[PDB]
């Protein structure tokens, strides 16, 4: 439909020019690459011109499973023994992970000072044509929900400009749930003079998004919430543990620490690591806690696909629907350290039908040859090959002429969960917000047009 | 109060950083100096950190006289003989003005094809050391009313950040009146397929503001209003007069031409002048018409101060209050000085002694044939502030 809708270069440029102005007028913006430390100039956030086609059934399935998925990862994060078991080996050959695990060990040894925590999740999916919905990533660490909403809103404007029906563009209000969840977390701390802290880099494209969150939180609190920004580097000097286990930022009590510095992604130096430790040992409500953040590493994602493992976290028969709904979104994955029957027959099928698999990258005849003659097995993993649905769209990026390209995407589904780490109870578990991230076959922001 | 409120460089920068982010998040923006033809990047509009002190009495006086002032200039614009009399001499030593006057002559000779017109006015004032003095009247290319509103809104945020009362910051909704007035003008043309045209430069800082007006007009019309942009240069090729005196933009009827290209300010070439003539001879509703635009030249401003001349345009005794209120604002002027911080892209904010001018905005929708007036509203204001400039808004005392 995108190619049919845009029938000339004149129309393309009128549409793009409207879109770019709309983006700036409505906060669909980022700091520039030249000045990631300054807000004096902004550029529009890179987006598709129109919302990419996406099947309704796959979308509704991804949305429907999300709350169950958040409950799963919350329970994983609460299961100290499972997490320590999952990390036993990789800690000995990854110093960064070792330090993070040691902070969780220190926090657990001293007893949980703050039971309330806020999980924030984006689950990523792709549409396999070799359509079926397949989970490809879970992110519980540093999570642009305002940008996603504004992208949906831009796309409705653009749909009207080409005479298309906007009812197939689904509602996208993830930022409202986020703000409410963060406000609820701050109220739960029980001190109206306690700070709300954005743990964040000095260099960041998304500063405008964070400021929007600040303004909304200040409005919700009727001006009572004091908001501050600090990095882990600056935090080494400015953050301290009080004698009552309060987190003190330059001597003032911190009620909530909302992190946009990825626990797994950011290679922190020794000082940054100590600042992280100070935060984790404090009684501040963490959004998210470190355990929540590392509950969704690739290792744990893989472990959760093994036989019987979902059932450990959903032991009751009343939750069998949640198990089935999550499992049917799993990508086929078979670690070759195991020599059980299901893995062995899988190896044989991959040798005979190598076009259907990937070995980790080996493909087709090379994959088959490697499986035939590899002794080496424990480090390799066999997976189902995924072929994404292709469509066509125009990308808007600052100073790039828009062109029609063949594109593929991933669906992101967002939500929050507010829970108690001591008894594993859940006060709030909501799916809200989504996005498409679209690339040529980093890519651009996008939103679904349901069919 | 500004100096007392900001008691450290650390606080100053936290406030400024909040303000700059707020500006970008809320559309208080301009195209960059490097790329006045492109919207890919934007900078925040230059503003004061806090609203400058301004006396309430002077402000209320400037607001109160505004509708009378719009009625005055509308009646001047309707008085063909007065305008031709006023320009008899200056046309012989100002070729630019001569060409504009000749277009009005050509339009008048053929009979007025479109009686409905929209006057848009900014009146500028300064505080003489206080008494309110009118220094300029602008009935040509106005714009920036959304920027003025957002500046007021930013200033309320900043007042709260330093614990000051926001009730002395007056309401600033000039953009709503503008949009309603332009929509009313478009409805009055009587053709739901007729275009709304922004007559505008390809290079312009305020493009974001115009797009905002477009979106609001599209919303008000329930998607029926088709909006286009054209310059006078491109207009020379793309605008024509139809055999029924319709203004045609690439063959499509134009219902309203809203101008942000100043009639008196922009030194137009021959082609641009012909495009202007084509617009003026058409039946499109002009916002504003050329007669309205040149009704507020410096020459006419001066002529309106001479004895008995206001009374020619307000002949009735029932309008004697309007005459007195306008005449009281007539004029060496020494402006009130205060202190403030300026926020400009890539400039560190510093405390300076500053002076300003008050701008008061409004619209008037009227009929050029019988001089009747359907709509006459003051709405919107601004401060423009300079070292003894930037956008600013008043803190009334």
Residue numbers in the entry:
A (entry chain A): 8 to 137, 146 to 158, 160 to 376, 385 to 399, 402 to 467, 478 to 487
B (entry chain C): 8 to 136, 146 to 347, 411 to 467, 479 to 487
Question: What do the authors report?
Answer:
It is synthesised in a two-step, ATP-dependent, process: glutamate-cysteine ligase (GCL) catalyses the formation of γ-glutamylcysteine (γ-EC) from glutamate and cysteine, followed by the addition of glycine by glutathione synthetase (GS) to form glutathione. Cyst nematodes have exploited a series of gene gain events to redeploy glutathione synthetase-like enzymes during parasitism, within the syncytial feeding cell formed in the host root.
To explore the catalytic capacity of nematode GS-like genes, the G. pallida representative of Clade 1 (Gpa-gss1), one representative from Clade 2 (Gpa-gss5) and a number from Clade 3 (Gpa-gss12, Gpa-gss17, Gpa-gss22, Gpa-gss24 and Gpa-gss30) were heterologously expressed in, and their proteins purified from, bacteria. Comparison between Gpa-GSS22-open and–closed reveals a functioning ATP grasp fold. In contrast, there is considerably more variation in the di-peptide binding pocket of G. pallida GS-like effectors, yet, this variation is not evenly distributed around the pocket. All six of these positions are substituted in Gpa-GSS22 and Gpa-GSS30, thus suggesting that the lack of canonical activity is because γ-EC is not accepted despite the potential for cysteine to be accommodated. Given that GS effectors have no appreciable rate of ATP turnover when supplied with canonical substrates, yet all display perfect conservation at the catalytic arginine, we infer that GS-like effectors possess a distinct catalytic activity, which may involve alternative substrate(s).
